[PDB]
Design a protein around this nucleic acid. Structure first.
Ligand SMILES: [Zn+2]
Ligand SMILES: [Zn+2]
Ligand SMILES: [Zn+2]
Ligand SMILES: [Zn+2]
Length: 823
DNA sequence: TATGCGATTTGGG
């Protein structure tokens, strides 16, 4: 008999095992084991959800597939133990995970215990098992409440979106609120218009001291800001024909305090800015550092530091830096006694280089965490700032700089590189004369609002009280690959389906899309977790406000229903029939479709032209002006002035669409001669017709399509422009049915040699290995070597040998050569 | 990468 300890990770199992001996046996349930599924209509709805809002939120949890073997293995080990310790993670999600464990195991409540720890160290684990607590039901309900609200919205708004807007549309309770933020930002940029203005730089020289770079600030006691080449040159020459004199010198002692230790949000931003880590990577690495006992729990909103940790770090600083770097009293940081702690090293003496079994990106993150934690307890840095004001004729120039006098906390956490006002100015004095050397003019433009990064969006979600440290990364992850937004060049871009759905939801679910209300809902869950509210009651108040909104939305758009997807007609003629085309938007994206679709199905034009959006490439990276210049490349709508989106119709026409589509019917067509991605592709002769075959890049790999609109004898594109042999027609088979559809099997040939696949591909997508038994009479060409035949044999393939062989099981195997077969 | 895979190249509103 012994004590059973259950965790959620083998990596977490091995590390906690180092501090548990004798009667403690640990086991890990790899992932979740129990969760929701993944009078007639309503009944089928609750079966799909696994939650009955009309029957007091009765839930029907179902064990996950492929987890049946782990549960039983965990069930067996339980009975062999006297007591059970649930060692899941700190947060509520972990509590709910621990609850699912107790539920599938069984037994009395006193048979279980809930341990809690900020870090996986000898001391911290000892303290956790010293006085284990019970499973907090209030915190579990705070999760299940959230989990239920998330599913209700997801499963009751989505079918409404299909009927009204487009198919394949998903909806999230908080995700729709995050998208709206991106959508709104997108509309601040498109509505913006960069304007031209100029700057001049006069590089001069001190009276035999050094070089002094200046910058014009004023002209005629008025701020100097020309708008074109002409006005500049007018000031340029005038500056050349002038004598430069210093007016004032202001020397001011400045400081810079270090930042607070990391919380989850601040960690993601610093890793994005300094390391270039996305939110997903940052949290993956942090979890690996946590489960290895290197850092504290990475889901936190506290900047608190334990007395031990503070004593630990202050000791290190004293030993390794000296008394100048140690403040008289510990540095305190404001947070949002929570019994929660910042993200920090578990041992300040462990360096990043001393990390075992941690990948490169995990070591970089630790170093980041380590340096911030050490610096957060060191002395402020001191500087000697000097600002110079220089007059020249009817002008007023300026220069600013500083000199490091005490590095302080920056000794352990230095900047990546120099900054703007980090130059060292030569010593001069009021009255000194400067000699002109070089005048440098520069053309600038006004900057539009900066796009969200994955981290800066989180920073915004936290500012508005939207979401929690436990859900920040899931929000960022779950708003992508939905067709609402996308991340390119480490920045968020709003898709058109984003703007459309967002607008729709704002019209029929105003409260659900409200920032403050969404923030209040997070509070209501905290209130449930703190025994200040009952969970089923909160759900009832939510579900009541939800149905009221949903009902009005389900109705027809005349009586307050949700407006259907609009359409903007173009002067574009259908290539199949003869009608004006319209710009419609789907889940997949934007395209052109014939107006001959509203007609009864007897006479509808099912022809569409996929509009391909131009690649917003900031790859040139023209500094912080990259997003600015990317906007200036856009045309302004001839109706509203809003920035337009560019699409390619054909290689001769180019469609510009207003940013406020479909609220603005504005568009333009740029006649020209454009190039597609596969313009430089190879050309080859078709086996059938004899015409040319060009390169098209589809979603299933690059391929060679014939240019004759009568045949489809294609070819596959290999690596580096190579083209495949003239293909081969598949071989069908009678009385060889499948295992899913009413389809039969056909013998194909691919990169994995020769195999056997469905006939209705890809509607079936069913494949198995052809038996040597398993035809031979219908075997085409040289494929008969396998049909020669030798436990029942089956045809295999080897990547190394690049030759096809056969094996058998129920371990026997054999190969072939230029002669025959051998075993 | 230990005897996993392959091949198709719209439709969408
Ligand atoms: Zn109310
Ligand atoms: Zn048509
Ligand atoms: Zn417009
Ligand atoms: Zn052909």
């Amino acid at each position: 008999g012994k004590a059973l300890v259950i965790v959620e990770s083998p990596a977490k199992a091995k590390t906690i095992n180092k501090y548990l001996g004798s009667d403690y046996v640990v086991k890990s349930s790899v992932g979740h084991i129990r969760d929701l599924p993944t009078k007639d209509e309503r009944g089928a709805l609750v079966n799909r959800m696994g939650v009955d809002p009309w029957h007091n939120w009765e839930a029907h949890y179902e064990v996950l597939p492929g987890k049946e073997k782990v549960v039983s293995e965990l069930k067996q080990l339980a009975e062999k133990a006297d007591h059970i310790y649930l060692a899941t993670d700190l947060d509520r999600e972990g509590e709910a995970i621990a609850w699912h464990l107790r539920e599938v195991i069984g037994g009395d409540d006193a048979r279980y215990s809930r341990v809690v720890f900020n870090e996986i160290t000898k001391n911290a684990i000892r303290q956790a098992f010293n006085k284990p607590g019970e499973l907090n039901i209030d915190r579990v309900n705070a999760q299940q409440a959230r989990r239920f609200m998330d599913r209700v919205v997801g499963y009751m708004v989505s079918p409404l979106l299909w009927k009204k807007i487009a198919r394949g549309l998903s909806a999230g309770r908080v995700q729709s609120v995050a998208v709206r933020l991106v959508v709104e930002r997108e509309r601040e940029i498109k509505a913006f218009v960069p304007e031209e203005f100029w700057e001049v730089d006069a590089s001069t020289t001190t009276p035999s001291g050094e070089a002094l770079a200046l910058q014009v600030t004023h002209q005629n006691d008025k701020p100097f800001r020309p708008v074109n080449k002409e006005q500049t040159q007018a000031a340029v020459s005038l500056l050349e024909k002038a004598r430069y004199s210093v007016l004032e010198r202001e020397d001011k002692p400045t400081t810079s305090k270090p930042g607070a230790p990391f919380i989850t949000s601040t960690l993601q931003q610093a890793a994005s800015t300094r390391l270039g880590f996305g939110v997903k990577k940052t949290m993956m690495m942090a979890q690996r550092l946590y489960e290895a006992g290197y850092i504290t729990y990475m889901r936190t909103d506290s900047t608190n530091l334990s007395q031990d940790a503070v004593n630990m770090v202050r000791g290190y600083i004293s030993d390794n830096f000296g008394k100048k770097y140690l403040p008289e009293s510990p540095n305190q940081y404001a947070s949002k006694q929570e019994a929660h702690e910042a993200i920090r090293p578990s041992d300040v003496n462990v360096m990043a280089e001393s990390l075992k079994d941690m990948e490169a990106d995990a070591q970089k993150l630790y170093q980041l965490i380590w340096r911030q934690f050490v610096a957060c307890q060191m002395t402020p840095a001191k500087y000697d700032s000097t600002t110079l004001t220089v007059g020249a004729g009817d002008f007023r120039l300026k220069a600013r700089g500083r000199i490091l006098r005490f590095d302080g906390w920056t000794k352990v956490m230095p900047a990546l590189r120099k900054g703007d006002e980090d130059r060292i100015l030569p010593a001069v004095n009021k009255g000194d004369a400067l000699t002109l050397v070089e005048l440098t003019p520069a053309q600038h433009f006004t900057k539009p609002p900066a796009r969200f990064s994955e981290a800066s969006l989180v920073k915004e979600l936290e500012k508005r009280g939207i979401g929690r440290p436990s859900t920040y990364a899931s929000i960022i992850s779950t708003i992508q690959d939905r067709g609402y937004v996308r991340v390119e060049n480490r920045r968020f871009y709003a898709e058109k389906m984003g703007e459309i759905v967002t607008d729709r939801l704002e019209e029929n679910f105003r409260e659900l899309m409200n920032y403050d209300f969404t923030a209040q809902m997070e509070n209501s869950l905290d209130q449930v977790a703190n025994h200040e509210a009952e969970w089923k009651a909160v759900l009832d108040h939510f579900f009541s406000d939800f149905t009221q909104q949903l009902d009005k939305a389900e109705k027809d758009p005349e009586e307050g229903g949700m407006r259907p997807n609009q359409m903007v007609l173009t002067s574009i003629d259908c290539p199949t029939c003869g009608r004006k085309m319209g710009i419609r938007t789907a889940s997949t994206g934007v395209f052109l479709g014939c107006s001959g679709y509203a007609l009864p199905p007897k006479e509808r034009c099912k022809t569409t032209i996929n509009l391909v959006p131009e690649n917003e490439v900031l790859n040139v990276l023209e500094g912080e002006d990259a997003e600015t210049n990317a906007l200036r490349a856009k045309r302004r709508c001839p109706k509203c002035g809003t920035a337009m989106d560019s699409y390619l119709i054909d290689p001769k026409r180019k469609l510009h669409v207003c940013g406020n589509n479909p609220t603005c019917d504005g568009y333009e067509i740029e006649e020209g001669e454009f190039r597609i991605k596969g313009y430089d592709g190879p050309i080859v002769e078709c086996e059938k017709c004899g015409s040319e075959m060009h390169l098209k890049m589809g979603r299933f790999g690059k391929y060679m399509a014939c240019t004759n609109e009568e045949c489809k004898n294609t070819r596959k594109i290999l690596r580096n422009g190579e083209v495949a042999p003239p293909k081969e027609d598949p071989v069908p088979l009678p009385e060889l049915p499948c295992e899913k559809s009413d389809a039969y099997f056909v013998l194909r040939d691919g990169a994995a040699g020769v195999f056997l696949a469905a006939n209705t591909f890809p509607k079936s997508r069913e494949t198995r290995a052809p038996l040597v038994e398993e035809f031979r009479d219908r075997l085409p060409e040289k494929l008969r070597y396998l049909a020669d035949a030798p436990n029942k044999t089956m045809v295999r393939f080897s990547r190394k040998t690049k030759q096809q062989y056969v094996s058998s099981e129920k371990g026997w195997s054999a190969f072939y050569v230029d002669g025959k077969w051998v075993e």
